[PDB]
Amino acid sequence: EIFLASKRAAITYNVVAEQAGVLNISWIASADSEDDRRASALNPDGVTMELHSGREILVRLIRHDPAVFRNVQNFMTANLMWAANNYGWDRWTQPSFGSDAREGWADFGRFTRDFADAILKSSAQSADPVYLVHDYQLVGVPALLREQRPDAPILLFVHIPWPSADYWRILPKEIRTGILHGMLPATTIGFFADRWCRNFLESVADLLPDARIDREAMTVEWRGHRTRLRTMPLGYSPLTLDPQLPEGIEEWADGHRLVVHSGRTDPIKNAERAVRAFVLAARGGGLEKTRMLVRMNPNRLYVPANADYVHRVETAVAEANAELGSDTVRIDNDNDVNHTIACFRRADLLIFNSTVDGQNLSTFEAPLVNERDADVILSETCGAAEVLGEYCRSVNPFDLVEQAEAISAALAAGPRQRAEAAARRRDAARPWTLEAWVQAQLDGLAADHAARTA
Amino acid sequence: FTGSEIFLASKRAAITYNVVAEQAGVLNISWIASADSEDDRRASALNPDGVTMELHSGREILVRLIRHDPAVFRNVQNFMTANLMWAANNYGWDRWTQPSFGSDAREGWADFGRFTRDFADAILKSSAQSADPVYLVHDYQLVGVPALLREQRPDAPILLFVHIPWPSADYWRILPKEIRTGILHGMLPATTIGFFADRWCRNFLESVADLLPDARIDREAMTVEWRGHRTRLRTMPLGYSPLTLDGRNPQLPEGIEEWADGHRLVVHSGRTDPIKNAERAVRAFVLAARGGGLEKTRMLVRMNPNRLYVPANADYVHRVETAVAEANAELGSDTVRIDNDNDVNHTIACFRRADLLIFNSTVDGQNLSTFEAPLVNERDADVILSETCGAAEVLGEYCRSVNPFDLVEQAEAISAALAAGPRQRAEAAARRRDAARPWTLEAWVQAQLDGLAADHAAR
Numbered sequence A: 001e002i003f004l005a006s007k008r009a010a011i012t013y014n015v016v017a018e019q020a021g022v023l024n025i026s027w028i029a030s031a032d033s034e035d036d037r038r039a040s041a042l043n044p045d046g047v048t049m050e051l052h053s054g055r056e057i058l059v060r061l062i063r064h065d066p067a068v069f070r071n072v073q074n075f076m077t078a079n080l081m082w083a084a085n086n087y088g089w090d091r092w093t094q095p096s097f098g099s100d101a102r103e104g105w106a107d108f109g110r111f112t113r114d115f116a117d118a119i120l121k122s123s124a125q126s127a128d129p130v131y132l133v134h135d136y137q138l139v140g141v142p143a144l145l146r147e148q149r150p151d152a153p154i155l156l157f158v159h160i161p162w163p164s165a166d167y168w169r170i171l172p173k174e175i176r177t178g179i180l181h182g183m184l185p186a187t188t189i190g191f192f193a194d195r196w197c198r199n200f201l202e203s204v205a206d207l208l209p210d211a212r213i214d215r216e217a218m219t220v221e222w223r224g225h226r227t228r229l230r231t232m233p234l235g236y237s238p239l240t241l242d243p244q245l246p247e248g249i250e251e252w253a254d255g256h257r258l259v260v261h262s263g264r265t266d267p268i269k270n271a272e273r274a275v276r277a278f279v280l281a282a283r284g285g286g287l288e289k290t291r292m293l294v295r296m297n298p299n300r301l302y303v304p305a306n307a308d309y310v311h312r313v314e315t316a317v318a319e320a321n322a323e324l325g326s327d328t329v330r331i332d333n334d335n336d337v338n339h340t341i342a343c344f345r346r347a348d349l350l351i352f353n354s355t356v357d358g359q360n361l362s363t364f365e366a367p368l369v370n371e372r373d374a375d376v377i378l379s380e381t382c383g384a385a386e387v388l389g390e391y392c393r394s395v396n397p398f399d400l401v402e403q404a405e406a407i408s409a410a411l412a413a414g415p416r417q418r419a420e421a422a423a424r425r426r427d428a429a430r431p432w433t434l435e436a437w438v439q440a441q442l443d444g445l446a447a448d449h450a451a452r453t454a
Numbered sequence B: 001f002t003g004s005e006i007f008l009a010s011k012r013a014a015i016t017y018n019v020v021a022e023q024a025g026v027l028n029i030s031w032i033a034s035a036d037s038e039d040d041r042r043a044s045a046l047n048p049d050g051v052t053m054e055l056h057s058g059r060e061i062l063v064r065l066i067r068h069d070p071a072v073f074r075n076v077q078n079f080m081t082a083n084l085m086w087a088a089n090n091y092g093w094d095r096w097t098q099p100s101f102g103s104d105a106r107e108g109w110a111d112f113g114r115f116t117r118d119f120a121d122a123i124l125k126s127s128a129q130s131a132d133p134v135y136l137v138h139d140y141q142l143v144g145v146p147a148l149l150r151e152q153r154p155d156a157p158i159l160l161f162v163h164i165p166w167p168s169a170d171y172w173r174i175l176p177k178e179i180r181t182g183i184l185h186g187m188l189p190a191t192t193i194g195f196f197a198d199r200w201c202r203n204f205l206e207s208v209a210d211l212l213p214d215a216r217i218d219r220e221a222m223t224v225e226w227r228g229h230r231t232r233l234r235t236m237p238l239g240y241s242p243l244t245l246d247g248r249n250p251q252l253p254e255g256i257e258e259w260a261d262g263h264r265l266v267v268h269s270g271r272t273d274p275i276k277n278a279e280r281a282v283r284a285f286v287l288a289a290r291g292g293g294l295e296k297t298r299m300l301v302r303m304n305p306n307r308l309y310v311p312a313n314a315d316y317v318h319r320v321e322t323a324v325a326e327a328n329a330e331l332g333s334d335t336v337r338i339d340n341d342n343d344v345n346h347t348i349a350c351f352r353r354a355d356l357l358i359f360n361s362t363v364d365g366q367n368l369s370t371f372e373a374p375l376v377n378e379r380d381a382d383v384i385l386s387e388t389c390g391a392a393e394v395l396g397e398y399c400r401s402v403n404p405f406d407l408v409e410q411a412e413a414i415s416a417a418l419a420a421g422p423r424q425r426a427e428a429a430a431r432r433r434d435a436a437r438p439w440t441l442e443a444w445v446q447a448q449l450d451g452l453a454a455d456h457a458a459r
């Protein structure tokens, strides 16, 4: 009786996919490629997939209008909404919204309707449907489901940050209020971090004059709807972690301590500042036997900011080597999860210094697989820092001096200090499994639902 | 405050041989400010007690200039206060690419601690032969001063009044740890902290709650309790100084009256500062005009040069020039003009002539022009006002309140303002003047005194 939906499914012929497997339910997601459109058309029952975890799932892909989907993905969600929720605008010079934003918003409504139709069509014969709506791209869905199913439990879980009210307000009026209107009819809105729940509540208080927020209870009362905000942290999926280095890396790292920065090709991952911080720390000859690997996993390169970030990182690494000597810093840029885990295991120092991050799962996974008791530098603005920051070197991701000094201190630490820190850090990470988080969703929603309906 | 001597301090005294200057005039008290130059130091040495200065408003004040170490000051001014600190509180960083703080930021903090001890020392020396001093400390360069005054004058009323925004907690947190905490430690010992807008007070309380684990905030009482100090946050709006708006009819700058002659005139006016948002103003104008529709309309971008040595400000001027060049290329030659000077007679004259006034700041501590301009305007000009100006909390309901980042919204507001008839414009402008008129400098000074006295009484 549980229905699960999220936009992104990268199929070839994922946390939401693992959750589908845990609950043994179908997963409604978007067809993006032509192959998905064909597979979906040819397979009305859904497409079956085995995940690495060994879980096997059924995925129902929605065939959107291709132009609507193109605009929504490339412009609205991955670019505009991304910069709105992940703090990428300077205000002085960007953004400047024109007609494109309005057409994007209309297209967004159409995409939203596609998901609501799929979810309602699929649940139509269900007497007591439970709706789990995942991701920021589906923020419009709860209002549509609520209109048809006034009594259904609806969780909206957002995997990315929620920005401060002043920053949320950057968006065009129809969009900044329209998104909030779409979300509040949910029974429960979930984020990974208290800071995001707080920012959400402030955004609502600021923009919606009829809303009453309660900061202590973390609730909104708005036009009938009572909505509860919950923080439900996620760390890792053990079954997905249950590898070998990329080519050249083991021999290149052989006689050295290895610093690893790892993340998507997304500006929030902050590899440019990580490299510049390493350079400050290595500035001759502050460090001698150390190399740095920048592991990048290509993702949404249809966004200009993402392409431009890659170039900025490449430029920084070349400048690093020009300074520190040839082959001090390398980039390895592929989407092999096996390579990522291998890099995690080999690291002497792990850097997850994001400008901001909804959670950051790498900061749980990496210490859990690392067999060198690697120290971890973690940005204070990652959702993960609310659970793990006391066990890592928590840093301001904009301060190169602070980061360089953390790098230097981490590499100076002996194996006995590193052993003890790493043990505490693993102990803190270990409870935050995918299975526990799924349970947290259902438990939170069940509790809130009784009050929501009342 | 019977029996009290009041002391007023602020950094900026652009004296060549200002709101704080007018306040010194209102209260008949000396103004302690920074010697920027060699001339300033000489004048201050020659006149230990102070230099007499007539303001154009007609008031006469005594100004006492503090000699700083020349290098300390140039760095505090050029890098810290004109540039780094400005971007922090006026929202000029994208986070993805800027800022990246290096060793210069830590040295800058150290220099800032010096400039701060300079002011606190001078203030305390000046008040040393006073039994019951009252300290009015103005604007963001002096954020460190209240802690030092409190340390040496535990029972003195201290107001710190910040003229610029206070940013959201997440944004304030961009700053290096020593600075983001250090500045809060500096401010909280004040009896009262004032801002021009409620939003700034709210953001300040959030920053304190976020960074200072020892502090307790009350969002409704607007208070902080931290390590002993109870601090009250107050919103004290300021609009205009009537003594700068009376007197003879001002004259327009060279050629403007001719050029604007047969046309409706859109005026954007402001300092050469990215927050003033002229580039978007011009692009919104172009969207509203093209192609036909605003045929008898011209646009004047009045810029007042200030801090052009800051790269962000130089870049802004370049972007505006570029947008004006592109506007003219599109709409026809000489449709949009830039006119730059710091002539206040020219500014008032342009306010007077405007058919449409645009004050569309990306953010603004208050913006006083949005009060002055409707008060002197002779044409019932409409006002487009950014919702992110502190002024909008008082005047937003009486103007066309816009999201300053939305070109479509702004173009539609330009079109709607110019489509309005004389009776609608007359009625709107009368309500707008009525809403603006009470917010005088004199009333704001009284608000400072009244708030401080009340908060001090709650010792």
Ligand SMILES: OC[C@H]1O[C@H](O[C@H]2O[C@H](CO)[C@@H](O)[C@H](O)[C@H]2O)[C@H](O)[C@@H](O)[C@@H]1O
Binding pocket: A008, A015, A159, A160, A264, A266, A299, A357, A358, A359, A360, A361
């Ligand atoms: O499509 C947006 C991103 O979704 C994922 O990342 C978000 O959700 C993660 C947990 O599922 C968080 O750790 C992270 O902070 C969020 O950005 C996905 O991992 C990314 O590849 C996507 O860009």
Ligand SMILES: OC[C@H]1O[C@H](O[C@H]2O[C@H](CO)[C@@H](O)[C@H](O)[C@H]2O)[C@H](O)[C@@H](O)[C@@H]1O
Binding pocket: B012, B019, B163, B164, B271, B306, B364, B365, B366, B367, B368
């Ligand atoms: O030195 C910073 C600026 O100070 C003034 O502007 C601030 O204070 C004004 C009121 O005194 C507000 O209207 C404005 O929003 C603030 O930015 C001064 O007018 C500016 O020239 C200075 O750059």
Ligand SMILES: [Mg+2]
Binding pocket: A007, A008, A073, A077, A078, A137
């Ligand atoms: Mg997307």
Ligand SMILES: [Mg+2]
Binding pocket: A078, A079, A082, A083, A303, A305, A306
């Ligand atoms: Mg992007």
Ligand SMILES: [Mg+2]
Binding pocket: A164, A165, A166, A168, A169, A202, A203, A204, A206, A207
């Ligand atoms: Mg808001």
Ligand SMILES: [Mg+2]
Binding pocket: A184, A185, A220, A221, A222, A223, A224, A225, A226, A227
């Ligand atoms: Mg609600």
Ligand SMILES: [Mg+2]
Binding pocket: A262, A263, A264, A362
């Ligand atoms: Mg990543």
Ligand SMILES: [Mg+2]
Binding pocket: A082, A266, A300
């Ligand atoms: Mg991304």
Ligand SMILES: [Mg+2]
Binding pocket: A078, A082, A266, A267, A268, A303, A305, A306
């Ligand atoms: Mg991105």
Ligand SMILES: [Mg+2]
Binding pocket: A272, A273, A276, B100
């Ligand atoms: Mg950098």
Ligand SMILES: [Mg+2]
Binding pocket: A380, A394, A395, A396
């Ligand atoms: Mg930290």
Ligand SMILES: [Mg+2]
Binding pocket: B013, B014, B015, B016, B035, B036, B037, B040
């Ligand atoms: Mg001077």
Ligand SMILES: [Mg+2]
Binding pocket: B011, B012, B077, B081, B082, B141
């Ligand atoms: Mg200054």
Ligand SMILES: [Mg+2]
Binding pocket: B084, B085, B086, B088, B089
């Ligand atoms: Mg500052």
Ligand SMILES: [Mg+2]
Binding pocket: B085, B140, B141, B143, B183
């Ligand atoms: Mg400051």
Ligand SMILES: [Mg+2]
Binding pocket: B176, B177, B178, B179
């Ligand atoms: Mg510091």
